[PDB]
Design a binder for this molecule. Structure first.
Ligand SMILES: Nc1ncnc2c1ncn2[C@@H]1O[C@H](COP(=O)(O)OP(=O)(O)OP(=O)(O)O)[C@@H](O)[C@H]1O
Ligand SMILES: Nc1ncnc2c1ncn2[C@@H]1O[C@H](COP(=O)(O)OP(=O)(O)OP(=O)(O)O)[C@@H](O)[C@H]1O
Ligand SMILES: Nc1ncnc2c1ncn2[C@@H]1O[C@H](COP(=O)(O)OP(=O)(O)O)[C@@H](O)[C@H]1O
Ligand SMILES: Nc1ncnc2c1ncn2[C@@H]1O[C@H](COP(=O)(O)OP(=O)(O)O)[C@@H](O)[C@H]1O
Ligand SMILES: [Mg+2]
Ligand SMILES: [Mg+2]
Ligand SMILES: [Mg+2]
Ligand SMILES: [Mg+2]
Lengths: 479, 469, 53, 41, 316, 128, 255, 160
């Protein structure tokens, strides 16, 4: 028995195998046990090696033979993973045979430096009225989806993924955006309903699902986000664009903590390791916009954070907020009121005033941005224009699940509210108004929507054409 | 002399030697690697073994791997060749422009200037910002701190100072990227090429660049602050010229220490920080100062976790600063930019003998009415504006105008705001608030003072609002 | 009308100050409980850190 | 300390800032009318 | 002592009796006399038959008198009984656990003795994974089905505590029981601005159900925002728009309260089982303003909206 | 002894608060991981196994009983504290006493709203 | 540096006044020679300015021939930066105050053990004046940073930590230091050592761990508020909270 | 500012005058300055007499200048002096402790230095026992009694 290449287990408990031997093993190298399970050598000590077990460690007894893979922990990457549900290591778990990948990339590679990057130019359309207008996301950007439990954090991610269909069905290759969902600590029933929701919307054919659920061990939950990021980097480097959703980084930190504390590493703030900022920073930094010299593609990151009782000032939330470019706060107060999605317009921001909105949205959203800000001060004499207009616009910002709108469609519904065709109308009737108005414009006025996309803005002819539609629709709506 | 790696746990690496044991702070070259990997010696564990910290990723390292001692600490390029060039913690270039052909070298670790080397010249430094120059004006050579929470506007404020001061400043400058977004470093690099600070085609650059962003490991971010100021130490000591040292963010230096303090063997201090937080900051900060030979005017951005100024990291830094600019989130959410707190920003040069009695009385007069304005706000909450007396209504009217007249659109933040950037002179700033406190613009509306340059544009904006109404 | 309005203000402000004092007493106790909890919790982090070494 | 009501950001703080903004929205309209009449006459 | 055991007994009384498949109760670290109360009550009703072989319930008990190792593993024991009916037979099972916190609480006790570094608030470091492996088994597969109503204890009325906080992710529907609501007299003391569900969606329940549900949560939120102003200044200083918002909110708060069948012995009032369609119509009428003239106490502890009006007619 | 031999007995633990701090001392000296208010993880188990032994035996097992009246000291009327809530979740009812009622002279000062005993209600005379 | 304070018998009630030259202090919160008066408040409230003006004021007595009324000053800089102490020493030089002033300086660059010792070193220098019939003033600026230095030293020595990671005997640190400052009776020389410790409160929190210790040690305290500073009250001494129990007797009848 | 020391001296005088019992003043962890102030006030009043043996107080000081080991055992030293007059002379003794918080603080400091894992709010695990073993010795007995007037500093004005 060669102690250099192979090694015997000294002690095993709580998914931490202390291995004697393995003198030639590298830091963060994968290892195979005699049972078949895989591991990862993190702690290299003089007398032993602290190995963490990927999966159930209860098959591993004392004195088992630990082999070497002879390579840093890596996962398969490519276009074969699209439409396939996989685990943290990159194995298929949807009963559709093995993956036909012909390439592998390391999990913990460094993020692109200063030279490969370039200012964020291209738009990342989520298809949500509140997001695209007020808090626009650009390609190669980190936008945090922070909020409490059951506040539609995941709902934003699904609507964003389903919104990419119109781009991916089209002929334009550079307008595409391949999605990569990553589940950390979620139960399988939640992920099973999620993949079906994508399948029902024809969204899976351009999306990857890295599932690391609560039944899976802590090392897999720790690794899953990095594995998904590596799959996104494949596109980023090779011309194409990609989107990734870490759902969520809070449960990753709990998994990383468990793993670290069982490796006898000392506890820090709230029992977390000392480098929990480094955990999320190196992951998120990899999300960037590459220049034309290196490829032109990008990787957009949408990390999720769960706040306890609306405490954004907590330890892990404050770390992720400082890392990301912008953040989107989802408050429970707006949620219970009926305002869904419950995106707080005041606190939520996006640090990018580039070509993310486009010229069409920039006109209508710019005026909506001011009026809502004017409203929010008064909301808390002849001056009911500001108070009414704000309530009317807030109702338009509501949006049902699994119904992402195009950029040209969002301009139409805002145009009615901004110009003042909902002022005399009742606040409760705006949901029915927009439903019938959106269905009407999509059904008949395809040339109008098409010309807004062609010109990229609201022209004088299109403005005059919109005036005739909303004025007649209003009179018809009312009795 | 040569040593073998005996243990590797995260960023911390233990290396054992047979005879030639290296001192502390020495750079150790790890053999059998693709990229360069420097390990800095932290502790002597005993039995001819030393505990080190990795300046880059530790993945791939094996037990019994060869490691050579350099002899001296981490030495880096210094001089005019560092200008217009980005470099690592360890000194290697990362701007795809070949090696740096420097003449002299300099170690990142060095003793701080002694008590006899300290200067006492307190000359005012006019930035062109209304809130700074009036209330908490910076000194030429002194140390400047920019406190602020997440996204309040530290990075926008420091780039505005780089835009205004560095261009007007004839001498050289240094920017130290410490644990911040690499995207911002990419934007800062190309922006200085457009404005013509960093020159590619010829050697006439006025800014040196050092970067250790949040993608880097703990050891890297804990040492770039030293790597950055070491370049500035050359422009101070060797070349008798004035220097500017911009840092963003200095919190990440102190943060980086705590990320490996547990693994080094320290018992954790209050709020999860290392017990050496005061001394590690002290030895670093004391080097950044104006000696009798040279002069470094530093501008350090300071992150404040959850806007908590009582936090050890920002709290300890207050003692090291001559002038402070504490950014508030409450002020930022009103629309006032820069969101500088007028009642929480001080300076040593704020003295009637240093900047004159007219500067002092007006500055203190703004802080008096703004402090009284807070006391009335409590009474307004219950009573309301209408019930108050004419004396109290006048105080609130003037105060709210002064709050908005403090705001100013920056040239760096044109894309964010939309308005054109401004730059108000010293005497124009002082005269503006003097007229408002005297009560010469009681007839004008408060909206005209919001986001404007000098007092002249406030009257000019009042005409536009009058025509529209 | 003035004497009736003045007496009502006196009574209304009296109830406001008394109701405010009632809330301060509750918040004072809640503050003291949370004050002790932070001291105890933060100390256990330090002891756990020392014990791990 | 002073200004504690607005720092808390509760019902009294939001109603206080709303009250101020209302009052000065009215006074803004009065003063803009004063500038109209002064400019014309 | 807010009302989980009363609530779970009511749900068993309502749902478990009107059900084709089997049921499974798991007494994890709770009162032993409650097991005796439940056992004899089920023999009384007939769901547990001693003579015949037609029992609808399977009992499993590792109560608070047992050591930690027992209480740490008894949740898995009762779980395995329900899994047999799901996997092999393919039956719709009704699982009932009380209390699931005692599984995690028992873990912390043994964790100390197992030689682990303690996590936040003295809990075990393997809090998520131990609960994860246990909870993930409790789910509806393709072949069978399991419906789990799990009672969850909240240490020191702190929902941010690790044990209850971690449990939220493993739930389709939550029911937060507040003490403040219980002390007022509103039973069951379910917090309407805290309890949530995933099936609550206009696509599933309908737009009428949804719009009425959020209308109730909106006016209760608006009522909660004005509590600071009412406490200091008073109701007189509020505007007429606000007065109506408060009046209806108090009536909506009281109409949420309901007399239970299991609470007939304790309270004395007869229990009520309100249908789904009548529930929506009751709150919808109050929101629109069809019962503003009636008093508040008429809505307190009644079944449908008809009995609330009948109770107001009794008063004069 | 009485319970098992067909006899009824009463026991008063005065008080379990002062027992808890005594057991906390032992655990903190044992160097066991502390939690809420520096109490160990098994402070619930401490009182649970004690109180469970207080029970009503059927005729088959003697027909005796053991009635428990554990006492708890709250600080500033904080019934939501760690130790009170643990003992509240074990016992079959509470008798909360207030400082306000006791100070006025209303003795015994019993909070009628918070104090309950549903199990003892069944074992009550029809006259009362 | 390590010496026990005077016992019960050598001491005596404070009698001779210690003139700061500040109206608010000398009138409402009078200090006596041998007393320990805390100068507590937030950053930028003017704590050091109270100390510096007190040192400058002693020139009037020290230039005179009356030996009983003289006062030798001692400033102990702890955890400050050298450029601040350089500015401080310049100010004392300009006012012609240095000739009777010792400046002990343990700056931020210095190792923690030096910051730990600096007060005790500075105190022992002041004890020399006390034990030779002369009067001395000592200013610990500040004891907050000493505790951080002492914490670093104790934690790195693997000594068991207590509240807020400070060592067990953190109260004893400042107690044995401040107790050494006293007023000796005629029989034991007749001299005195007057202490003016400084504490930095976080957000005006007087009930914090380290401030509460030092407040409970000293004979009185001078609270400084940020609110009062910006309103116009400079020095920003809150009269309501600031008190001096011992120094009320040690005051001229004219005042 | 409320005649604290005057009240203390009167209780010493009145108990000695009426009940014929001597007193003891245990100075636990307070200011040595205050110990000097009281010592001379007692001489001024007459409860202490330096000329003849008619003194009514036995002073036992261990102030904040002394280490935590000393301060923790000062109350026991003064207590033992009071126990003589109860057990041997059969008197109604009066034992002052100024103050009881410093006895508790010293016990917390000693426990911390030994390396015992602290309890709630940074206090020692042996909080109840350390207090209990001292306070239980202050009682009425067959032979006599010890009544104790203990000063209390409530930290942060928090009784909890
Ligand atoms: N725009 C919307 N309209 C209607 N219902 C919505 C909307 N957004 C979310 N919901 C409802 O709220 C529920 C919770 O949303 P979601 O699960 O996305 O939030 P979450 O923060 O991810 O919660 P968790 O992470 O705890 O599962 C969903 O089941 C859905 O029915
Ligand atoms: N009486 C006074 N009148 C006018 N200005 C004063 C007065 N006292 C202090 N100041 C000013 O207040 C500022 C702060 O003073 P000082 O440094 O003494 O406060 P500090 O609390 O010691 O500061 P730090 O704690 O940061 O060292 C100085 O710039 C000083 O000029
Ligand atoms: N001078 C300014 N004018 C307008 N907006 C600003 C200004 N400074 C900051 N901001 C706002 O804050 C954001 C940038 O903050 P940033 O400088 O990144 O703060 P930090 O560096 O503390 O994170 C932008 O999205 C912008 O809207
Ligand atoms: N639906 C209800 N109606 C009236 N009272 C209730 C109801 N539910 C609970 N209670 C009261 O709460 C007390 C404790 O209930 P229980 O379910 O035992 O709480 P827990 O499960 O938290 O121990 C009961 O004694 C009863 O008085
Ligand atoms: Mg989710
Ligand atoms: Mg920044
Ligand atoms: Mg129960
Ligand atoms: Mg100072």
């Amino acid at each position: 028995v060669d102690l250099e290449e192979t090694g015997r287990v000294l002690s095993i408990g709580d998914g931490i195998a202390r291995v004697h031997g393995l003198r030639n093993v590298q830091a963060e190298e994968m290892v195979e046990f005699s049972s078949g399970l895989k591991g990862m050598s993190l702690n290299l000590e003089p007398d032993n090696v602290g190995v963490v077990v990927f999966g159930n460690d209860k098959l591993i007894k004392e004195g088992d033979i630990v082999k070497r893979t002879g390579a840093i922990v890596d996962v398969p990457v490519g276009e074969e993973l699209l439409g396939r549900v996989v685990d943290a290591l990159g194995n298929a778990i949807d009963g559709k045979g093995p993956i036909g990948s012909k390439a592998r990339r390391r999990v913990g590679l460094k993020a692109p430096g200063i030279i490969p990057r370039i200012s964020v130019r291209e738009p990342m359309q989520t298809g949500i009225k509140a997001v695209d207008s007020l808090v626009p996301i650009g390609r190669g950007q980190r936008e945090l989806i922070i909020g409490d439990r059951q506040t539609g954090k995941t709902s934003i991610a699904i609507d964003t993924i389903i919104n990419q269909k119109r781009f991916n069905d089209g002929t334009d290759e550079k307008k595409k955006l391949y999605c990569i969902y990553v589940a950390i600590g979620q139960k399988r029933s939640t992920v099973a309903q999620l993949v079906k929701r994508l399948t029902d919307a024809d969204a899976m054919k351009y999306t990857i699902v890295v599932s690391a659920t609560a039944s899976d061990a802590a090392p897999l939950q720790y690794l899953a986000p990095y594995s998904g990021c590596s799959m996104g980097e494949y596109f980023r480097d090779n011309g194409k664009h990609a989107l990734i959703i870490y759902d969520d980084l809070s449960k990753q930190a709990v998994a990383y903590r468990q793993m670290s504390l069982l490796l006898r590493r000392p506890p820090g703030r709230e029992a977390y390791p000392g480098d929990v900022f480094y955990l999320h920073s190196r992951l998120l930094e990899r999300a960037a916009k590459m220049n034309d010299a290196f490829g032109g593609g990008s990787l957009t990151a949408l990390p999720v954070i769960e706040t306890q009782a609306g405490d954004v000032s907590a330890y892990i939330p404050t770390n992720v907020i400082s890392i990301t470019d912008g953040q989107i706060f989802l408050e429970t107060e707006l949620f219970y009121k009926g305002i869904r999605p419950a995106i707080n317009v005041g606190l939520s921001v996006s640090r990018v005033g580039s070509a993310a909105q486009t010229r069409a949205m920039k006109q209508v959203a710019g005026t909506m941005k001011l009026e809502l800000a004017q409203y929010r001060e008064v909301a808390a004499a002849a001056t009911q224009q500001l108070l009414s207009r704000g309530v009317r616009l807030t109702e338009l910002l509501k949006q049902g699940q699994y119904s992402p709108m195009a950029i040209e469609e969002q301009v139409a519904v805002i145009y009615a509210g901004v110009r003042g065709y909902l002022d005399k109308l009742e606040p409760s009737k705006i949901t029915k108004f927009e439903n019938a108005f959106l269905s009407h414009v999509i059904s008949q006025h395809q040339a109008l929507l098409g010309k807004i996309r062609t010109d990229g803005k609201i022209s004088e002819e299109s403005d005059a054409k919109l005036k005739e539609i909303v004025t007649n629709f209003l009179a018809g709506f009312e009795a | 002399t040569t040593g073998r790696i005996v243990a590797v746990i995260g960023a911390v690496v233990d290396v054992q030697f047979d005879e030639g044991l290296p001192p502390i702070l020495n750079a150790l070259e790890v053999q059998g690697r693709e990229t360069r990997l420097v390990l800095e010696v932290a502790q002597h564990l005993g039995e001819s073994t030393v505990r080190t910290i990795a300046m880059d990723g530790t993945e791939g390292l094996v037990r019994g791997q060869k490691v050579l001692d350099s002899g001296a600490p981490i030495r880096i390029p210094v001089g005019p060749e560092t200008l217009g060039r980005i470099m690592n913690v360890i000194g290697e270039p990362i701007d795809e422009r070949g090696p740096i052909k420097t003449k002299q070298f300099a170690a990142i670790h060095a003793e701080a200037p002694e008590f006899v080397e300290m200067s006492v010249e307190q000359e005012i430094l006019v930035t062109g910002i209304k809130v700074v120059d009036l209330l908490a004006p910076y000194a030429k050579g002194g140390k400047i701190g920019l406190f602020g929470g997440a996204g309040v506007g530290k990075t926008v404020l420091i780039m505005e100072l780089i835009n205004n001061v560095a261009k007007a400043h004839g001498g050289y400058s240094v920017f130290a990227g410490v644990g911040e977004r690499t995207r911002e470093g990419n934007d800062l690099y190309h922006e200085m090429i457009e404005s013509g600070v960093i020159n590619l085609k010829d050697a006439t650059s006025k800014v040196a660049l050092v970067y250790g962003q949040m993608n880097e490991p703990p050891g890297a971010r804990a040492r770039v602050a030293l790597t950055g100021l070491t370049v500035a130490e050359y422009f101070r000591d060797q070349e008798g010229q004035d220097v500017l040292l911009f840092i963003d963010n200095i919190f990440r230096f102190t943060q980086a220490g705590s990320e490996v303090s547990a693994l080094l063997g320290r018992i954790p201090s209050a709020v999860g920080y290392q017990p050496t937080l005061a001394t590690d900051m002290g030895t670093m900060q004391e080097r950044i100062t104006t000696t009798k030979k040279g002069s470094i005017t530093s501008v350090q951005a300071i992150y404040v976790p959850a806007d908590d100024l009582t936090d050890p990291a920002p709290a300890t830094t207050f003692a090291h600063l001559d002038a402070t600019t504490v950014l508030s989130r409450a002020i930022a959410e009103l629309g006032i930019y820069p969101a500088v707190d007028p009642l929480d920003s001080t300076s040593r040069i704020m003295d009637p003998n240093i900047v004159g009695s007219e500067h002092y009385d007006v500055a203190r007069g703004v802080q008096k009415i703004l402090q009284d304005y807070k006391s009335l706000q409590d009474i307004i909450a219950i009573l309301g504006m209408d019930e108050l007396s004419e004396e109290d209504k006048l105080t609130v009217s003037r105060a709210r105008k002064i709050q908005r007249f403090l705001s100013q659109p920056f040239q760096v933040a044109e894309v964010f705001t939309g308005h054109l950037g401004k730059l108000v002179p010293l005497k124009e700033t002082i005269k503006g608030f003097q007229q408002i406190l005297a009560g010469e613009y009681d007839h004008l509306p408060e909206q005209a003072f919001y986001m404007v340059g000098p007092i002249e544009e406030a009257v000019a904006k009042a005409d536009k609002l009058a025509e529209e109404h | 009308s003035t004497t009736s309005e003045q007496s009502a203000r006196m009574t209304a402000m009296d109830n406001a100050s008394k109701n405010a004092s009632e809330m301060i007493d509750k918040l004072t106790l809640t503050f003291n409980r949370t004050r002790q909890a932070v001291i105890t919790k933060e100390l256990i982090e330090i002891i756990s850190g020392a014990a791990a070494l | 300390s002073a200004g504690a009501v607005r720092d808390a950001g509760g019902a009294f703080g939001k109603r206080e800032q709303a009250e101020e903004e209302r009052y000065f929205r009215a006074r803004a309209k009065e003063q803009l009318a004063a500038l109209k009449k002064h400019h014309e006459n």
